[PDB]
């Protein structure tokens, strides 16, 4: 099964790098995304990574 949890690693760097867009209001979105990533299952990994790419605003 593949949902996109693989992005967890691809974005794992963003959380410490500088995101992709870096320079958007995504920071306000990551606020809730970060807490939603708590998803015990991996199905949440693909949902958190998406917000991780934009999290660049808060990461940077």
CSV table of C-alpha atoms in Angstrom, one decimal:
chain,number,residue,atom,x,y,z
A,1,UNK,CA,0.0,0.0,0.0
A,2,UNK,CA,1.2,3.5,-0.9
A,3,UNK,CA,-0.4,6.7,0.3
A,4,UNK,CA,2.6,9.1,0.3
A,5,UNK,CA,4.1,8.5,3.7
A,6,UNK,CA,7.4,8.2,1.9
A,7,UNK,CA,7.5,12.0,1.7
A,8,UNK,CA,8.1,11.9,5.5
A,9,UNK,CA,11.8,11.6,4.7
A,10,UNK,CA,11.8,13.9,1.7
A,11,UNK,CA,10.3,16.6,4.0
A,12,UNK,CA,12.2,15.5,7.1
A,13,UNK,CA,14.9,17.8,5.9
A,14,UNK,CA,12.6,20.8,5.4
A,15,UNK,CA,11.6,20.7,9.1
A,16,UNK,CA,15.3,21.8,9.5
A,17,UNK,CA,16.1,23.1,6.1
A,18,UNK,CA,14.1,26.0,4.5
A,19,UNK,CA,11.0,24.4,3.1
A,20,UNK,CA,10.1,24.6,-0.6
A,21,UNK,CA,8.2,27.8,-1.0
A,22,UNK,CA,9.7,29.5,2.1
A,23,UNK,CA,7.8,32.9,2.2
A,24,UNK,CA,4.1,32.1,2.5
A,25,UNK,CA,1.4,32.2,5.2
A,26,UNK,CA,1.7,28.5,5.4
A,27,UNK,CA,3.2,29.1,8.8
A,28,UNK,CA,-0.4,29.4,10.2
A,29,UNK,CA,-1.3,26.1,8.5
A,30,UNK,CA,1.7,24.2,9.9
A,31,UNK,CA,0.6,25.2,13.4
A,32,UNK,CA,-2.3,22.7,13.1
A,33,UNK,CA,-0.5,20.4,10.7
A,34,UNK,CA,2.3,19.7,13.2
A,35,UNK,CA,-0.2,18.7,15.9
A,36,UNK,CA,-2.2,16.6,13.4
A,37,UNK,CA,0.9,14.7,12.4
A,38,UNK,CA,0.6,12.9,15.7
A,39,UNK,CA,-1.4,10.4,13.8
A,40,UNK,CA,-0.4,7.1,15.3
A,41,UNK,CA,-0.8,5.4,11.9
A,42,UNK,CA,1.3,6.1,8.8
A,43,UNK,CA,-1.7,7.3,6.8
A,44,UNK,CA,-1.1,10.6,8.6
A,45,UNK,CA,2.5,10.8,7.4
A,46,UNK,CA,1.4,11.7,3.8
A,47,UNK,CA,-0.9,14.3,5.3
A,48,UNK,CA,1.7,15.9,7.5
A,49,UNK,CA,4.5,15.9,4.9
A,50,UNK,CA,2.3,18.0,2.6
A,51,UNK,CA,2.2,20.8,5.2
A,52,UNK,CA,5.9,20.2,6.0
A,53,UNK,CA,7.0,21.4,2.5
A,54,UNK,CA,5.2,24.7,3.1
A,55,UNK,CA,6.3,24.8,6.7
A,56,UNK,CA,9.5,26.4,5.4
A,57,UNK,CA,8.1,29.7,6.6
A,58,UNK,CA,8.2,28.5,10.2
A,59,UNK,CA,11.3,26.4,9.7
A,60,UNK,CA,13.3,29.2,8.2
